[PDB]
Amino acid sequence: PEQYRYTLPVKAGEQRLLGELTGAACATLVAEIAERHAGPVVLIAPDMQNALRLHDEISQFTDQMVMNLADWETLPYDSFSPHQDIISSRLSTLYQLPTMQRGVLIVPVNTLMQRVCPHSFLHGHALVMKKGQRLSRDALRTQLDSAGYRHVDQVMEHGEYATRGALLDLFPMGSELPYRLDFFDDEIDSLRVFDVDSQRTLEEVEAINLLPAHEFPTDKAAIELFRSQWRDTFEVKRDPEHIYQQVSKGTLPAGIEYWQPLFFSEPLPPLFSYFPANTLLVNTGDLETSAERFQADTLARFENRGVDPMRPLLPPQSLWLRVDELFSELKNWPRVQLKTEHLPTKAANANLGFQKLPDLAVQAQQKAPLDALRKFLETFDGPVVFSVESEGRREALGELLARIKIAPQRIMRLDEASDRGRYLMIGAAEHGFVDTVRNLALICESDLLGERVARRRQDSRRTINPDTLIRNLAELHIGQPVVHLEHGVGRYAGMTTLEAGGITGEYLMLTYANDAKLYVPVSSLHLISRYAGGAEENAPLHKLGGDAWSRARQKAAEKVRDVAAELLDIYAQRAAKEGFAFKHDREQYQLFCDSFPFETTPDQAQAINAVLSDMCQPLAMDRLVCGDVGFGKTEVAMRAAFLAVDNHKQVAVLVPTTLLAQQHYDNFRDRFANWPVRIEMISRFRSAKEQTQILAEVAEGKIDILIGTHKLLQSDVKFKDLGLLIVDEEHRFGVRHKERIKAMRANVDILTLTATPIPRTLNMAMSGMRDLSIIATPPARRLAVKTFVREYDSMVVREAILREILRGGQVYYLYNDVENIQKAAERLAELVPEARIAIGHGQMRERELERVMNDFHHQRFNVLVCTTIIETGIDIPTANTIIIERADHFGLAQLHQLRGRVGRSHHQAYAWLLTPHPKAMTTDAQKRLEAIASLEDLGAGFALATHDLEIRGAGELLGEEQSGSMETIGFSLYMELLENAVDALKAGREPSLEDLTSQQTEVELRMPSLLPDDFIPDVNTRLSFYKRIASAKTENELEEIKVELIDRFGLLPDPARTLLDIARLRQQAQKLGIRKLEGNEKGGVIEFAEKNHVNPAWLIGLLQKQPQHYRLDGPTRLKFIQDLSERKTRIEWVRQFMRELEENAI
């Protein structure tokens, strides 16, 4: 009858406690408490941990606005400023808050106690701009400088704006995405949104709001104000590093935000000052415990960090509220309190009917795995609603529920749930609850399949193109190894501007041996490619004009053919031999899978089905799968074996080292735990006697799965019916054994595994030569990651850990490995009692892996001590600070590999490469470090190193012999020869298809052909376009590029149109022959190729009707005389002439 037990509070200090709630309970409650209340709802969260998890949950049960006031995520009086996306987010929220009419906003007690800027600030320093305002570009540019934005070239992050002639790109603080203006005679023409990666313009827009670029003014005034009030509060010092001194010179020190006060005359108000009048607060946990713990750490830091003579600190009063004022302010608003525990019948309380779901998990042991769920469903009256995270997970339920004759009906809003209905809604809800009050059931995947693991696979956000960076040499730094087809491997030296026949042209400088400097015409850039070899440190330095190259370029083609051959007949042969089909049985299979309740990656499943199929076809299988150590990469091998044993066939698994064997042994035992499958291992961990007693059981057919070292090769092991061979990391067994392997390979299906992945490109090539399935490592993204190189200093380690923990994240802690990893763990828990340490042993078993992953998803542990790089490979998304105790003994290879393990979009991630006393460090290592210490974010180098890696993988797949030519000419060209040698050996011809050499076309019209300095100032940016244009190949590729240019830099100069146009002629030139075409003021000279498409009837008819315009010169040239006095005329005619030439061709 009353819609509910509770009634909403309306007056200051009026609580309305609600009790006995469980899982997605609050979630759904805050959602309701938001729909019945004309006003806003500020949901104070006890810890940042909860809030972030809350935003996604509440969002499931409402079409309302679920918002979040972000926290600086820095440490009180930190040495780091907030990350932009955080400040942008805040400014957005504060700015809108007062006019907030409906919805939810989530604030951590942490953040709520922090003081905000005066609402005078935002309201006043705010501005707008529309489709046609009277603001000149160079004006706004100055305005932007006052607002405190930064002039940049590219404009990638919030708070920046860039200049490029007719255009203006800015990423305004209150917005989600950046804007590209474009002006017209002092009047702003249009406004366009644009992607920072693409840089292209997406949607068309008509308006833009412009908030400041900080939560505190930076204009001329502010700084004078800052100086004053400073002098008013602390002593001053000349020293160039004193905050005063710095803020004066127009510089913004790092921990500035904790000085916000001084940028204002007024005090900083209490966040509440922004809450609308009809705002309703909502609680969780007990704020007072939290609120006090913070006040304690704030004060704690106020004394310790308050010693730097260059950074005197402000009193905690100016920045934060007292636990008193917090509740003092808190008393002014009505506020529903949410509690889990049962409530005592006080009239102002409620006690919503919510209970913990039954025990519905799946049991792989029981002969009816899903009956708990089956009977619970045929024993319920009300609705069931099954919650799922992805539209790809919804699919998983179907496959699951189908086995109990249930195909749920989709809801959207919970209200659509009537009786006996079985519903399913897509949402972030972790796990269920029961609804006494209205008898409703909510079942999330976790309640049904153990417990999820926290990883999200979409990267689209910031994906760095493997191609781009390499195909277009996008971030080429002076000194990096470059490759010229004609000469070899040099080193980028920059770009210059020289003089030809009185026409300025641009050139790419490349140094070679003995500082021999080669100058490359921008128009010939197509003969250039970035060096690839997995070893950047070691790159050939060919001598310019030397013989070496031309040779190496051949030796390589030689080997590449041998390889393409050896493979091609071997694949062909195995394709003509009869093997063994394996049947399958979808049912038996599905049951095995029961013992693995986890979502498989798409790359992954692709592989499983791939491996399974090859097994079911009447031909011996011989696949290779290249993945990582992500939770579940073992599943392929697992399922492979399940299939061979379900067919009563023994399985052998070879591994390089015992530790691996053991690991493999373990994993197998735990995977087939619910099956009568006998498993055994032969390795150092077995005396001779036992080896004997085992091999014996093997011959008898009593062992379904044997696992062993090379010792499994040493002996002449007899199997009663071997059908599957699984070799892990074959590449590292060593000559003698490798042979013994290809020997134990015939007559049986084979499955080879390996970590090191392979390049996408080398994949399409192999198709038909080697069966391969690749489990790609998620793309490299451009993420905020500050890297530091410090000498071990515990106070750093400590603050470092702390800083992550206070934001609800975890920390990786790769260690030295001198002592006992168990002591290091203690030694660190002592240092940081606020934290809780876990350990991560090498060769983690899947079981260990999921335990650690889960514990971390439940904040159960917030620091993980590691011993190896591979361990740091674990998948934890909230681990965004990685510490490396003895970083010195690691190569860029690995650092980078480590550096990237941290990182979350819209948030700052850190990495502390720790070192020893300068005298214990190797001169080489020191320089190696300082190099990375120079990187400000995770961009190129990482994505590039990710590339190198895949190359070593390539080397491994093909051979130490191939890794050589790969290292000698550059993976780029190697694949060039290969892709060729293959297509060739396939069609039936021969590899000497050294056709690789270009038509050597040269189309010069004695006019400027280039991208002008003041059109595209960034040298490097230009360079990319050159290569792109040089390399373009169709007429459409050049237009696309043209469009990009105009859309990103506007009006196309003349040297530009030219560049492009000539580029197009040069093409037409090839399609038609023409090994050269010079043009000038007076006419020109076409130089044709032996094989051309010039119709003689046409030419001869041209020679006679127009004598004074065309004369032959030699059996190959054709001179032409015309009035090409003006640059625009010349080009026009030459194009027209090409047109006419091809329209008559033969």
PDB file of N, CA, C and O in Angstrom, residues 1007-1030:
ATOM      1  N   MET A1007      59.743  23.804 -60.184  1.00  0.00           N
ATOM      2  CA  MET A1007      58.919  24.668 -59.321  1.00  0.00           C
ATOM      3  C   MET A1007      59.136  24.135 -57.915  1.00  0.00           C
ATOM      4  O   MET A1007      59.723  23.066 -57.754  1.00  0.00           O
ATOM      5  N   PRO A1008      58.733  24.889 -56.875  1.00  0.00           N
ATOM      6  CA  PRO A1008      58.943  24.366 -55.518  1.00  0.00           C
ATOM      7  C   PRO A1008      57.993  23.199 -55.237  1.00  0.00           C
ATOM      8  O   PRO A1008      56.789  23.282 -55.496  1.00  0.00           O
ATOM      9  N   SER A1009      58.529  22.106 -54.720  1.00  0.00           N
ATOM     10  CA  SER A1009      57.693  20.956 -54.413  1.00  0.00           C
ATOM     11  C   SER A1009      58.010  20.603 -52.965  1.00  0.00           C
ATOM     12  O   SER A1009      59.052  20.016 -52.671  1.00  0.00           O
ATOM     13  N   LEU A1010      57.128  20.987 -52.053  1.00  0.00           N
ATOM     14  CA  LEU A1010      57.377  20.696 -50.659  1.00  0.00           C
ATOM     15  C   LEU A1010      56.314  21.249 -49.734  1.00  0.00           C
ATOM     16  O   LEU A1010      55.420  21.996 -50.144  1.00  0.00           O
ATOM     17  N   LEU A1011      56.427  20.842 -48.478  1.00  0.00           N
ATOM     18  CA  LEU A1011      55.540  21.289 -47.425  1.00  0.00           C
ATOM     19  C   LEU A1011      56.281  22.447 -46.748  1.00  0.00           C
ATOM     20  O   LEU A1011      57.334  22.264 -46.144  1.00  0.00           O
ATOM     21  N   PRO A1012      55.742  23.659 -46.857  1.00  0.00           N
ATOM     22  CA  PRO A1012      56.312  24.883 -46.282  1.00  0.00           C
ATOM     23  C   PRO A1012      56.435  24.924 -44.757  1.00  0.00           C
ATOM     24  O   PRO A1012      55.499  24.575 -44.056  1.00  0.00           O
ATOM     25  N   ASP A1013      57.587  25.374 -44.258  1.00  0.00           N
ATOM     26  CA  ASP A1013      57.847  25.517 -42.816  1.00  0.00           C
ATOM     27  C   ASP A1013      56.684  26.107 -42.030  1.00  0.00           C
ATOM     28  O   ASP A1013      56.315  25.575 -40.994  1.00  0.00           O
ATOM     29  N   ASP A1014      56.114  27.211 -42.503  1.00  0.00           N
ATOM     30  CA  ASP A1014      55.028  27.841 -41.765  1.00  0.00           C
ATOM     31  C   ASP A1014      53.632  27.282 -42.077  1.00  0.00           C
ATOM     32  O   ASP A1014      52.606  27.914 -41.773  1.00  0.00           O
ATOM     33  N   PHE A1015      53.597  26.095 -42.676  1.00  0.00           N
ATOM     34  CA  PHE A1015      52.344  25.420 -43.006  1.00  0.00           C
ATOM     35  C   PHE A1015      52.263  24.250 -42.035  1.00  0.00           C
ATOM     36  O   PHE A1015      51.217  23.960 -41.466  1.00  0.00           O
ATOM     37  N   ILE A1016      53.393  23.580 -41.866  1.00  0.00           N
ATOM     38  CA  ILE A1016      53.514  22.443 -40.977  1.00  0.00           C
ATOM     39  C   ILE A1016      54.856  22.635 -40.310  1.00  0.00           C
ATOM     40  O   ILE A1016      55.873  22.112 -40.771  1.00  0.00           O
ATOM     41  N   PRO A1017      54.886  23.438 -39.240  1.00  0.00           N
ATOM     42  CA  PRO A1017      56.115  23.719 -38.493  1.00  0.00           C
ATOM     43  C   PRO A1017      56.840  22.518 -37.917  1.00  0.00           C
ATOM     44  O   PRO A1017      58.067  22.444 -37.971  1.00  0.00           O
ATOM     45  N   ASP A1018      56.101  21.567 -37.369  1.00  0.00           N
ATOM     46  CA  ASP A1018      56.775  20.420 -36.790  1.00  0.00           C
ATOM     47  C   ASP A1018      57.540  19.616 -37.827  1.00  0.00           C
ATOM     48  O   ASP A1018      56.953  18.881 -38.618  1.00  0.00           O
ATOM     49  N   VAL A1019      58.857  19.745 -37.831  1.00  0.00           N
ATOM     50  CA  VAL A1019      59.645  18.991 -38.791  1.00  0.00           C
ATOM     51  C   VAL A1019      59.107  17.566 -38.884  1.00  0.00           C
ATOM     52  O   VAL A1019      58.536  17.165 -39.896  1.00  0.00           O
ATOM     53  N   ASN A1020      59.256  16.814 -37.806  1.00  0.00           N
ATOM     54  CA  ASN A1020      58.796  15.441 -37.780  1.00  0.00           C
ATOM     55  C   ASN A1020      57.411  15.177 -38.378  1.00  0.00           C
ATOM     56  O   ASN A1020      57.229  14.181 -39.079  1.00  0.00           O
ATOM     57  N   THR A1021      56.439  16.045 -38.089  1.00  0.00           N
ATOM     58  CA  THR A1021      55.074  15.893 -38.622  1.00  0.00           C
ATOM     59  C   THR A1021      55.136  15.919 -40.152  1.00  0.00           C
ATOM     60  O   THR A1021      54.507  15.108 -40.838  1.00  0.00           O
ATOM     61  N   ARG A1022      55.892  16.879 -40.672  1.00  0.00           N
ATOM     62  CA  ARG A1022      56.076  17.039 -42.111  1.00  0.00           C
ATOM     63  C   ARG A1022      56.648  15.752 -42.667  1.00  0.00           C
ATOM     64  O   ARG A1022      56.078  15.128 -43.561  1.00  0.00           O
ATOM     65  N   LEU A1023      57.798  15.378 -42.126  1.00  0.00           N
ATOM     66  CA  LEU A1023      58.461  14.178 -42.558  1.00  0.00           C
ATOM     67  C   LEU A1023      57.453  13.060 -42.755  1.00  0.00           C
ATOM     68  O   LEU A1023      57.469  12.391 -43.784  1.00  0.00           O
ATOM     69  N   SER A1024      56.555  12.862 -41.799  1.00  0.00           N
ATOM     70  CA  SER A1024      55.591  11.786 -41.960  1.00  0.00           C
ATOM     71  C   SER A1024      54.787  11.946 -43.220  1.00  0.00           C
ATOM     72  O   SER A1024      54.577  10.982 -43.947  1.00  0.00           O
ATOM     73  N   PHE A1025      54.336  13.161 -43.503  1.00  0.00           N
ATOM     74  CA  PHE A1025      53.542  13.349 -44.702  1.00  0.00           C
ATOM     75  C   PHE A1025      54.321  13.074 -45.972  1.00  0.00           C
ATOM     76  O   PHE A1025      53.785  12.533 -46.944  1.00  0.00           O
ATOM     77  N   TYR A1026      55.594  13.436 -45.963  1.00  0.00           N
ATOM     78  CA  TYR A1026      56.416  13.190 -47.122  1.00  0.00           C
ATOM     79  C   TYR A1026      56.355  11.709 -47.399  1.00  0.00           C
ATOM     80  O   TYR A1026      55.841  11.287 -48.427  1.00  0.00           O
ATOM     81  N   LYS A1027      56.854  10.919 -46.462  1.00  0.00           N
ATOM     82  CA  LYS A1027      56.860   9.479 -46.624  1.00  0.00           C
ATOM     83  C   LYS A1027      55.497   8.969 -47.072  1.00  0.00           C
ATOM     84  O   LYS A1027      55.396   8.157 -47.993  1.00  0.00           O
ATOM     85  N   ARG A1028      54.440   9.450 -46.430  1.00  0.00           N
ATOM     86  CA  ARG A1028      53.118   8.995 -46.795  1.00  0.00           C
ATOM     87  C   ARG A1028      52.813   9.265 -48.258  1.00  0.00           C
ATOM     88  O   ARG A1028      52.334   8.377 -48.959  1.00  0.00           O
ATOM     89  N   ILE A1029      53.109  10.480 -48.717  1.00  0.00           N
ATOM     90  CA  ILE A1029      52.883  10.881 -50.114  1.00  0.00           C
ATOM     91  C   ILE A1029      53.802  10.127 -51.098  1.00  0.00           C
ATOM     92  O   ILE A1029      53.383   9.633 -52.152  1.00  0.00           O
ATOM     93  N   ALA A1030      55.070  10.056 -50.737  1.00  0.00           N
ATOM     94  CA  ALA A1030      56.048   9.370 -51.549  1.00  0.00           C
ATOM     95  C   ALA A1030      55.597   7.953 -51.774  1.00  0.00           C
ATOM     96  O   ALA A1030      55.637   7.441 -52.893  1.00  0.00           O
TER      97      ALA A1030
END
